[PDB]
């Protein structure tokens, strides 16, 4: 839910989550890739 480390950009969650958590949603969450999974 969190990441998975990614790199020096493991903040890919946080602001990508911020347009689909501003719908209502969970945000995102960074998959085993290290890639941001924005639902929304």
């Given at each position: 839910?969190?990441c998975?480390l990614?790199?020096?950009?493991?903040?890919?969650?946080?602001?990508?989550?911020?347009?689909?958590?501003?719908?209502?949603?969970?945000?995102?969450?960074?998959?085993?890739?290290?890639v941001?999974?924005?639902?929304?």
């Amino acid at each position: 839910a969190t990441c998975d480390l990614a790199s020096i950009f493991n903040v890919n969650h946080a602001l990508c989550a911020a347009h689909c958590i501003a719908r209502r949603y969970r945000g995102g969450y960074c998959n085993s890739k290290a890639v941001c999974v924005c639902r929304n």
